[PDB]
Amino acid sequence: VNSFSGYLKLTDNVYIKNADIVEEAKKVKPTVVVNAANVYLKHGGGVAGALNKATNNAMQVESDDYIATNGPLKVGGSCVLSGHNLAKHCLHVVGPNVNKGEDIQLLKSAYENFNQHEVLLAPLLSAGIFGADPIHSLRVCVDTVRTNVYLAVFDKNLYDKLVSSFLE
Numbered sequence: 001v002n003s004f005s006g007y008l009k010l011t012d013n014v015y016i017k018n019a020d021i022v023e024e025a026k027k028v029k030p031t032v033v034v035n036a037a038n039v040y041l042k043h044g045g046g047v048a049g050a051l052n053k054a055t056n057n058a059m060q061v062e063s064d065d066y067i068a069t070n071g072p073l074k075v076g077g078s079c080v081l082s083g084h085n086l087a088k089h090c091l092h093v094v095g096p097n098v099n100k101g102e103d104i105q106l107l108k109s110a111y112e113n114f115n116q117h118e119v120l121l122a123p124l125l126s127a128g129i130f131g132a133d134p135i136h137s138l139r140v141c142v143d144t145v146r147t148n149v150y151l152a153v154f155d156k157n158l159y160d161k162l163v164s165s166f167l168e
């Protein structure tokens, strides 16, 4: 039903809110929820762990069956799988993990996957323990994504820093 509320409008297609992506999925019932995935789809911690736990492990079971038959994704790539109880679909996107030495230029390719969907609920790619500069990730999102993207950032200080930096 894509009923998003309480978002700040940054540009004509990019919105942001201080919220847990899981709670937004439950309230919004979006067509697509983006997962900040890794190449073998191991959803242990962070955003991926929160989304998986909210599906009572159904996401990990489905992802293990996908990997068994298809092998790992590439950095910058994506995979559409079921969204289970959280959304119609889950778009698993692999952004670069710069804390593990992966190339930050691939963050543009990671965001380009969003353009295949008219509207998406998403986290800020490569932020948190992946180590990319969050202000840079927001700039790449704004410059690359043309479809409607609703970013949920679950940290008040980071959300406030992003909004202030964007409005500079």
Ligand SMILES: CNC(=O)c1c[nH]c2ncnc(N[C@H](c3ccc4c(c3)S(=O)(=O)CCC4)C(C)C)c12
Binding pocket: 019, 020, 021, 022, 036, 045, 046, 047, 048, 050, 123, 124, 125, 126, 127, 128, 129, 130, 152, 153, 154, 155, 158
């Ligand atoms: C541990 N719980 C969470 O991180 C979240 C749960 N629910 C969430 N909704 C939104 N953002 C969340 N987190 C943010 C974040 C955004 C991107 C990425 C990560 C973490 S990561 O550390 O999982 C690595 C992969 C990329 C941080 C920056 C506030 C959570």
